[PDB]
Write a protein that binds this DNA or RNA. Structure first.
Ligand SMILES: [Zn+2]
Lengths: 143, 191, 172, 52, 137
RNA sequence: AGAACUGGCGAUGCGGGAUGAACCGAACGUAGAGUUAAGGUGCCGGAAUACACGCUCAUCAGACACCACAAAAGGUGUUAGUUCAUCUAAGCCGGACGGUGGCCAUGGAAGUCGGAAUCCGCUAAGGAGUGUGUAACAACUCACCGGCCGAAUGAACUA
RNA sequence: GCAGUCAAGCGUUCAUAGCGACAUUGCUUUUUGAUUCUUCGAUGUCGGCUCUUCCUAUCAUACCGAAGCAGAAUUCGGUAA
């Protein structure tokens, strides 16, 4: 079916939410024939990327209102065409490995998914310097 | 099959006022004011607010209904013409004899006058329509620019100028000389 | 073929010592009087069973009146008919107050649009359409929308006399 | 002589057209039917032919 | 001016609750209500109060009036009556010139020859006092 | 031009078909009153510019048996219908592409002269520069592109 | 005699610029036949001369659209008698 096929996208996607802990939503608006894709085999020990037809992509979301509602915060960034890096860690280094494939003028990310957050991404934990000197900085300002 | 009602919508932007009475439409904005007789079509107007006026046909067949959108458009271009305005640009195109183009007048009239077309000794004249105003670009070679509130009158006056240079008895794929419409858009709002 | 009434026609093959009590068959026939209806009964039966009215008999003929002759219904109409160049099945919809009212417009419509006289059409089925939006046909759906209203522009009143001392208006 | 882009301009008018095969009308290049009543609005169209 | 002005034809609408005046037939003269629209040409009407029988009618033998009252569509005769009454439809009609002229015209037509004579004599009286007025200011 | 059965014309007016041997109606003493036939009822002209639902717009409409002709074939005119497919899991605006110039031929020959197949594949785009300009730099600009989108939609057909 | 529909083929390549087989629908009544209705107590043959008028299936001339229209020349086609 084609509602099988609609569902099919739904089926797998949910499964991938339920198969990874992190998720990078990388923007895949524009960009097209042969290049990046062929690097992705090589990068598929970390992720699944999926390109697909938008209204379909949206309706997948509708089917996921059932649980894991934090994916609702992906929703304002569904726009255009976006694509998935289903993922576990680094979100700021591994991510950058994924990013690097050869730019165009940055190929081509314009959005982030960080489990309810939307970084640059470039800051997430590196010294616990927002938890020993910035979880007590107005404790510092006033004891 | 007869459509029991069918309607279209006309956004009135800030600063303009459209008033219609027995299908005679008067549209007024910052640029000026246009009017148009719509008596030849049975359509009914209805003002929802000052931003928005509707047009319907009641119980109409296909061809009638086809008249609906077209009324909407005509009235839309009245509103655009009197806010942003219209501008059509042309280019002289000639392989050899340069086409020599000026404004001239008789009885305070105003004509676009075209000389040397394909080396012709004859002079071509095109009356400049009222409301439409002619310029000549300063920094595009051979340009000619007609503008005004009335797309109808600008566009026809441009058409008149190109139709007057047609090239008779020559293969018109080889002999491409002419004045052609090269761009068309608005007075205000970039180019 | 006129102002229609609908009849139950019930008939059967004549009894034989071999088969007394032969099976009974019914048709609902739309016609204007009962002579036509029984004609019509036989015309159809002959195309469906070996029987000519010379071997059969009509057991009962009864007019079927519309049950709710002022509820407005949307009817599905199924029709077989002949064109100048072949024969066709066709589904149409009709909005009306009675089958008998619907069927009559069916016949006018087959005449107007397809130039089908009565001899050329068979009514296959006629049925109230239960649930709105099982209605399939735009030109009837149009009437089904909520709080439906429309004007009747350009009213022409008929005049009783030949001259009139005022220029008329179409104002409704 | 004549810059490429103006030759192109001139061609939208002079040559990027199609032609009715019954009645010869100069027609829009993406047209499906002839606009003319004399040929029955035929849909027998061909491209206008390009120079050498 | 400076508002957009658009006068819009204010047609009497065929609609549930629209009240109509029957031109032809046996219910000629009487008021009924549109209950349900059948198509661009037919409607179900019902005039319980004037005693015009709920029936499918062709719009061409009816004339739309300006009056309309609240009536759910499909409403059967009983509830048509309740609603027509609640609404005071006859009250409104009677008050109209339209209904008044019909009444006037009806009354004239019933005048006796003697009565016609009296109207003459009375008219001549009114006339008289009028012409002297129309002559003073 | 020549036969079959019947009915006609010829031998026959009358009413209708404008007209007209043969069609339709109906056959004939002199008349009155009524009623019809076939055919008609905007006006010529006796009789509804009657009632009802549609369909049709022709810069060559059409308009009534015999009868005073039109066909193949076409139409994105407009009407109603059919079948197949999409769709609550009409239809619109952009995604239609790589390994492998794969394997026979041969500038190229790819899906893309030609022969035989078309197997697998994967899900993201800057042409050493289009021009101005310099023998050549600089600057601006654009290419597998679309936001898509909102109880119908797409295609092929019938008359 | 004149005009179409289909499109295999022609046309270096390319069905339809111009053409167009096998088939197939028509139109015309200046060809020639077929018929024998009128005229055999009469309707004066062929051609030319002279003169008027009409048709259009247009040769020229006006304005156009096509092209295997570069120019010149032509050819196809429209409105046109
Ligand atoms: Zn054509």
């Amino acid at each position: 079916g084609i509602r099988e096929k609609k569902a099919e996208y739904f089926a797998k996607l949910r499964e991938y939410l339920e198969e990874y802990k992190s998720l990078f939503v990388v923007g895949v608006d524009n960009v097209s024939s042969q290049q990046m894709h062929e690097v992705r085999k090589e990068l598929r020990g970390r992720a699944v990327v999926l390109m697909g037809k938008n209204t379909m992509v949206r309706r997948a979301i509708r089917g996921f209102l059932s649980d894991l509602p934090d994916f609702e915060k992906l929703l304002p960034f569904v726009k255009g065409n976006v694509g998935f890096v289903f993922t576990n860690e680094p979100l700021t280094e591994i991510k950058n490995v994924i990013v690097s494939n050869r730019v165009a003028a940055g190929l081509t990310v314009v959005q982030v998914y960080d489990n309810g957050q939307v970084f640059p991404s470039s800051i997430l934990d590196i010294t616990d310097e927002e938890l020993v000197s910035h979880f007590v900085s107005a404790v510092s300002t006033i004891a | 099959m007869k459509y029991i009602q069918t309607e279209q919508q006309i956004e009135v932007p800030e600063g303009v006022t459209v008033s219609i009475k027995s299908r005679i439409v008067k549209v007024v904005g910052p640029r000026g004011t246009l009017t148009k007789n719509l008596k030849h079509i049975d359509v009914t107007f209805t003002k929802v607010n000052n931003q928005l006026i509707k047009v319907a046909v009641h119980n109409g067949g296909r061809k009638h209904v086809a008249a609906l959108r077209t009324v909407k458009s005509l009235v839309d271009n009245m509103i655009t013409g009197v806010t942003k305005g219209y501008k059509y640009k042309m280019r002289y195109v000639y392989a050899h004899f340069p086409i020599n183009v000026n404004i001239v007048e008789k009885d305070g009239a105003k004509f676009i006058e075209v000389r040397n077309f394909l080396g012709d000794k004859k002079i071509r004249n095109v009356p400049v329509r009222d409301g439409v105003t002619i310029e000549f670009s300063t920094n595009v070679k051979d340009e000619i620019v007609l503008s005004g509130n009335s797309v109808e009158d600008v566009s026809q006056n441009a058409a008149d100028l190109q139709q007057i240079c047609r090239v008779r008895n020559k293969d018109i794929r080889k002999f491409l000389d002419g004045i052609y419409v090269s761009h068309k858009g608005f007075i205000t709002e970039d180019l | 073929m006129a102002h229609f009434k609908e009849y139950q026609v019930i008939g059967r093959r004549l009894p034989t010592e071999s088969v007394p009590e032969p099976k009974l068959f019914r048709m609902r026939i739309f016609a204007s009087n009962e002579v036509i209806a029984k004609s019509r009964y036989w015309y159809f039966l002959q195309k469906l069973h070996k029987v000519k009215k010379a071997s059969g008999e009509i057991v009962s003929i009864n007019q079927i009146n519309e049950a709710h002759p002022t509820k407005v219904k949307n009817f599905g109409v199924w029709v077989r008919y002949d064109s100048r160049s072949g024969t066709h099945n066709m589904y149409k919809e009709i909005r009306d107050v009675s089958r008998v009212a619907a069927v009559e417009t069916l016949y006018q419509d087959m005449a107007a649009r397809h130039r089908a006289r009565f001899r050329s059409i068979h009514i296959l089925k006629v049925a109230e359409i239960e649930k709105t939006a099982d209605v399939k046909r735009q030109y009837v759906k149009q009437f089904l929308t909520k709080d439906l209203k429309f004007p009747l522009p350009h009213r022409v009143q008929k005049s009783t006399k030949t001259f009139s001392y005022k220029r008329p208006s179409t104002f409704y | 002589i004549i810059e490429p882009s103006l030759k192109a301009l001139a061609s939208k008018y002079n040559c990027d057209k199609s032609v009715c095969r019954k009645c010869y009308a100069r027609l829009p290049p993406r047209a499906t039917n002839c606009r003319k009543r004399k040929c029955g609005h035929t849909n027998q169209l061909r491209p206008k032919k390009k120079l050498k | 001016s400076t508002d957009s002005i658009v006068k819009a034809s204010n047609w009497r609408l065929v609609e549930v609750g629209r009240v109509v005046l029957i031109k032809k037939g046996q219910s000629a003269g009487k008021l009924a209500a549109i209950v349900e629209i059948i198509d661009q040409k037919k409607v179900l009407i019902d005039g319980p109060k004037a005693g015009v029988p709920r029936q499918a009618i062709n719009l061409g033998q009816v004339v739309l009036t300006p009056l309309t009252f609240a009536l759910p569509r499909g409403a059967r005769t009983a509830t048509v009556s309740k609603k027509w009454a609640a609404a005071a439809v006859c009250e409104k009609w009677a008050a109209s010139s339209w209904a008044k002229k019909i009444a006037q015209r009806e009354r004239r037509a019933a005048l006796t020859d003697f009565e016609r004579f009296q109207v003459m004599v009375l008219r001549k009286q009114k006339r008289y006092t009028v012409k002297k007025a129309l002559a003073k200011a």
